[PDB]
């Protein structure tokens, strides 16, 4: 494909940087200027000197980048790139919890809607949720939208966690079952199990290490053979970072359809047409920024 070389000429003449999440297609990872989890992506978005950000991720991640860079152009290659977990949390869920627990801080995953983040005291990802919640003064915390991460946070902080909404979860990581753990140990007897904290608690209890995708990268040096309980394209990421090690997905069907809405072709069309421009209403942007900034400073 001359498509790769044409993306690179376009981004260079646009003064653009391509930021990509770890779950992006291999073709997208191979052209990205930076690849990381959502916390690393949020951090990288605070030191962008480029004029344009092309965000190879889901729409609410791109909105976070826009909240952190209101002066810059942020493009999402497809407006259908979205997070099913984040869409489960409505503002009314938060207000109801705030009425019932008036002194609980509101702690939302950074991928939530900008409207929901406007009601957060602080945001988190899987990478920093325990560290942030531990620092909060209150013993009661409103937390969402992922109930499986909420379970993990309650276990690691000892605090009372009120999940909002009740059914919030990521369907990709919810796919994993104890049956998949048992099958992994038979297929790969010498491997260790990396499990993401968005998996269900009984699956997490089987892990050798429980870690966000950034944590999986930091801890892969502890063993040479891993079975990976997270989204399929993280296995590609690990294999390219560590060619000398062995990695295997726990389920080949554990893939995020929203992440896969971004392709090499619509990144090219994104740079060619300067679309689609990400905008956040000023009122909502300002309130969400305060919680995202608190997250960065508390991490
Ligand atoms: O990078 C993360 O925090 C993350 C971790 C697990 C599942 N999804 C995400 C995401 O950003 O959409
Ligand atoms: S992986 Fe799960 S959480 Fe991350 S974007 Fe896809 S649906 Fe949302
Ligand atoms: Cl992660
Ligand atoms: Na991640
Ligand atoms: Na993260």
From Swiss-Prot:
<dbReference type="GO" id="GO:0005737">
    <property type="term" value="C:cytoplasm"/>
</dbReference>
<keyword id="KW-0004">4Fe-4S</keyword>
<dbReference type="InterPro" id="IPR023066">
    <property type="entry name" value="Quinolinate_synth_type2"/>
</dbReference>
<comment type="function">
    <text>Catalyzes the condensation of iminoaspartate with dihydroxyacetone phosphate to form quinolinate.</text>
</comment>
<dbReference type="GO" id="GO:0051539">
    <property type="term" value="F:4 iron, 4 sulfur cluster binding"/>
</dbReference>
<keyword id="KW-0808">Transferase</keyword>
<keyword id="KW-0411">Iron-sulfur</keyword>
<protein>
    <recommendedName>
        <fullName>Quinolinate synthase</fullName>
        <ecNumber>2.5.1.72</ecNumber>
    </recommendedName>
</protein>
<dbReference type="GO" id="GO:0008987">
    <property type="term" value="F:quinolinate synthetase A activity"/>
</dbReference>
<keyword id="KW-0662">Pyridine nucleotide biosynthesis</keyword>
<dbReference type="GO" id="GO:0046872">
    <property type="term" value="F:metal ion binding"/>
</dbReference>
<feature type="binding site">
    <location>
        <position position="213"/>
    </location>
    <ligand>
        <name>iminosuccinate</name>
    </ligand>
</feature>
<feature type="binding site">
    <location>
        <position position="126"/>
    </location>
    <ligand>
        <name>iminosuccinate</name>
    </ligand>
</feature>
<keyword id="KW-0479">Metal-binding</keyword>
<dbReference type="InterPro" id="IPR003473">
    <property type="entry name" value="NadA"/>
</dbReference>
<feature type="binding site">
    <location>
        <begin position="196"/>
        <end position="198"/>
    </location>
    <ligand>
        <name>iminosuccinate</name>
    </ligand>
</feature>
<feature type="binding site">
    <location>
        <position position="256"/>
    </location>
    <ligand>
        <name>[4Fe-4S] cluster</name>
    </ligand>
</feature>
<comment type="pathway">
    <text>Cofactor biosynthesis; NAD(+) biosynthesis; quinolinate from iminoaspartate: step 1/1.</text>
</comment>
<feature type="binding site">
    <location>
        <position position="38"/>
    </location>
    <ligand>
        <name>iminosuccinate</name>
    </ligand>
</feature>
<feature type="binding site">
    <location>
        <position position="21"/>
    </location>
    <ligand>
        <name>iminosuccinate</name>
    </ligand>
</feature>
<dbReference type="InterPro" id="IPR036094">
    <property type="entry name" value="NadA_sf"/>
</dbReference>
<comment type="subunit">
    <text>Monomer. Homodimer.</text>
</comment>
<feature type="binding site">
    <location>
        <position position="83"/>
    </location>
    <ligand>
        <name>[4Fe-4S] cluster</name>
    </ligand>
</feature>
<comment type="similarity">
    <text>Belongs to the quinolinate synthase family. Type 2 subfamily.</text>
</comment>
<keyword id="KW-0963">Cytoplasm</keyword>
<feature type="binding site">
    <location>
        <begin position="109"/>
        <end position="111"/>
    </location>
    <ligand>
        <name>iminosuccinate</name>
    </ligand>
</feature>
<feature type="binding site">
    <location>
        <position position="170"/>
    </location>
    <ligand>
        <name>[4Fe-4S] cluster</name>
    </ligand>
</feature>
<keyword id="KW-0408">Iron</keyword>
<dbReference type="GO" id="GO:0034628">
    <property type="term" value="P:'de novo' NAD biosynthetic process from L-aspartate"/>
</dbReference>
<dbReference type="Pfam" id="PF02445">
    <property type="entry name" value="NadA"/>
</dbReference>
């Amino acid at each position: 494909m001359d498509l790769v070389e044409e993306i690179l000429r376009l981004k260079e003449e646009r003064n653009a940087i391509i930021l990509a999440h770890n779950y992006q297609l291999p073709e997208v990872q191979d052209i990205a200027d930076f690849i990381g989890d959502s916390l690393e992506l949020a951090r990288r978005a605070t030191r962008v000197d480029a004029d344009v950000i092309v965000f190879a991720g889901v729409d609410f991640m791109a909105e976070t980048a826009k909240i952190l860079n209101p002066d810059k152009v942020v493009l999402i290659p497809s407006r259908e790139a979205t997070c099913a977990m984040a869409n489960m949390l409505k503002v009314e869920h938060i207000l109801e919890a705030k009425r019932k627990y008036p002194n609980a801080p509101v702690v939302l995953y950074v991928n939530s809607t900008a409207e929901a983040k406007a009601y957060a005291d602080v945001t988190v990802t899987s990478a920093n949720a325990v560290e942030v919640v531990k620092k909060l003064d209150s013993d009661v915390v409103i937390f969402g939208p992922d109930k499986n991460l909420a379970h993990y946070v309650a276990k690691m902080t000892g605090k009372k966690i009120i999940p909002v909404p009740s059914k919030g979860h990521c369907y990709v990581h919810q796919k994993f079952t104890l049956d998949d753990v048992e099958r992994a140990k038979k297929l790969h007897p010498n491997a260790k199990l990396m499990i993401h904290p968005e998996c269900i608690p009984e699956v997490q209890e089987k892990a050798d290490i429980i870690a966000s995708t950034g944590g999986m990268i930091k801890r892969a040096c502890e063993w040479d053979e891993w079975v990976v309980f997270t989204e399929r394209e993280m296995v590609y990421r690990l294999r390219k970072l560590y060619p000398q090690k062995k990695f295997y997905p726990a389920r080949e069907d554990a893939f995020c359809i929203g992440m896969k809405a971004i392709t090499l072709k619509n990144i090219y069309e994104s740079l060619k047409d300067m679309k689609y421009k990400v905008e956040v209403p000023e009122e909502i942007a300002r309130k969400a920024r305060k919680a995202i900034e608190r997250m960065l400073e508390m991490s």
